[PDB]
């Protein structure tokens, strides 16, 4: 499993969400964050998604395309290993908790 | 060491905190985040806790029980490897920084 | 690559930013978070920085020094493995996405 973090332009959130939803991924966590530029703050949105290793390329692909504008500040995708997930309500683990 | 992230219902925060505190874990980081549902935002709370590997099962156990309601949307526990921690004020490392 | 997370006193943000900037690191993500104390909330700032393995010691060093006050609550540095990064706008990967 992988924990995919996406930092994007706040206005691209719906496009990213619908795009992920189009590939069966609806459960995401959104966080309001800030970046910097010339030194002012620049509002951004952080999306965290927990996935199976097999979904990595598809996610990177759909997310890139959906978050894209072509103007600087489009954002980045970060990938890290997710060792375990537990669905609190049922106690289901990993893929059953995704 | 492990970095345990817990996404829960905002109103279950105190129960989770007191539960963790009951097992000697008081230092947590809380973040306000959002999830989605049928497509509206749903407020959530993210708790990040840095722990020793030996505390993983106990944490998963106490946290699950404390965050539980039985209604959907209870949340999830995510587990990742924590390679190093440094307590800024003293320079203490890892377990001494926990 | 590594994902370095820094939790600090909100007022030390500029000092940390200028310090990182002094070593060529300008791209950071800032998040407003909360800690606890005796049980009240205590405002904090979370900075996430993506780096090459070779920058770890220098970052830990400059950040520690810059965030320091000597009073309790100074914060902590957490280190985790960053497996991949993709710059959305160009598709550049890893070091080219840093």
UniProtKB/Swiss-Prot annotation, chains A, B, C:
InterPro entries under this entry?
N-reg_PII, N-reg_PII-like_a/b, N-reg_PII/ATP_PRibTrfase_C, N-reg_PII_CS, N-reg_PII_urydylation_site
Keyword list (alphabetical) reads: ATP-binding, Cell inner membrane, Cell membrane, Cytoplasm, Membrane, Nucleotide-binding, Phosphoprotein
Q: Which GO terms describe its molecular function?
A: ATP binding; enzyme regulator activity; identical protein binding
The answer, when asked if Cell inner membrane is one of the entry's keywords, is yes
- Null phenotype? Mutant lacking this gene shows very high expression of the glnK and nac promoters in nitrogen-starved cells, and has a severe defect in the growth rate recovery in ammonia after nitrogen starvation.
Briefly describe its induction.
Expression is regulated by the nitrogen status. May be regulated through the NRI/NRII two-component regulatory system.
GO CC terms in record: cytosol; plasma membrane
Q: Which residues bind ATP?
A: 37, 50, 73-76, 87-89
PTMs per UniProt: Uridylylated/deuridylylated by GlnD. Fully uridylylated in nitrogen-limited conditions and deuridylylated when extracellular ammonium increases. Uridylylation abrogates binding to AmtB.
- Asked if the record carries the keyword Kinase, the reply is no
Q: Where does ADP bind?
A: 29, 50, 73-76, 87-89
Instruction: Give the record's free-text account of how this protein's activity is regulated.
Output: Formation of the GlnK-AmtB complex is influenced by intracellular pools of the effector molecules ATP, ADP, Mg(2+) and 2-oxoglutarate. The rapid drop in the 2-oxoglutarate pool upon ammonium influx and a simultaneous, but transient, change in the ATP/ADP ratio promotes AmtB-GlnK complex formation. ADP orients the surface of GlnK for AmtB blockade. The GlnK-AmtB interaction is also controlled by the level of intracellular glutamine and the uridylylation status of GlnK.
Q: Which PROSITE patterns match?
A: PII_GLNB_CTER, PII_GLNB_DOM, PII_GLNB_UMP
Q: Which GO terms describe its biological process?
A: positive regulation of nitrogen utilization; regulation of nitrogen utilization
Family per record: Belongs to the P(II) protein family.
Domains as described in the record: Uridylylation probably sterically blocks the T-loop region from interacting with AmtB.
Q: Report the function annotation for this chain.
A: Involved in the regulation of nitrogen metabolism. Regulates the activity of its targets by protein-protein interaction in response to the nitrogen status of the cell. Involved in the regulation of the ammonium transporter AmtB so as to optimize ammonium uptake under all growth conditions. In nitrogen-limited conditions, GlnK does not interact with AmtB, which remains active and imports ammonium. When extracellular ammonium increases, GlnK associates tightly with AmtB in the inner membrane, thereby inhibiting the transporter activity.
Complex and partners: Homotrimer. In response to elevation of the extracellular ammonium concentration, interacts and forms a complex with AmtB. Binds to the cytoplasmic face of AmtB with a stoichiometry of AmtB(3):GlnK(3). Sequestration by AmtB is reversible. In nitrogen-poor medium, can form heterotrimers with GlnB (PII protein).
What is the protein name given in its UniProt record? Nitrogen regulatory protein GlnK
Tell me the organism. Answer: Escherichia coli (strain K12)
Q: State the taxonomy lineage.
A: Bacteria, Pseudomonadati, Pseudomonadota, Gammaproteobacteria, Enterobacterales
């Amino acid at each position: 499993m992988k924990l995919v973090t996406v930092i994007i332009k706040p206005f691209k959130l719906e496009d990213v969400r619908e795009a992920l939803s189009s590939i069966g991924i609806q459960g995401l966590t959104v966080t309001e964050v800030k970046g910097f530029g010339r030194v002012n703050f620049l509002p951004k949105v952080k999306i965290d998604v927990a996935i199976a290793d097999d979904q990595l390329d598809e996610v990177i692909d759909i997310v890139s395309k959906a978050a894209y504008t072509g103007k600087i500040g489009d954002g980045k995708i970060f990938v890290a290993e997710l060792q375990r997930v537990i669905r609190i309500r049922t106690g289901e683990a990993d893929e059953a908790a995704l």
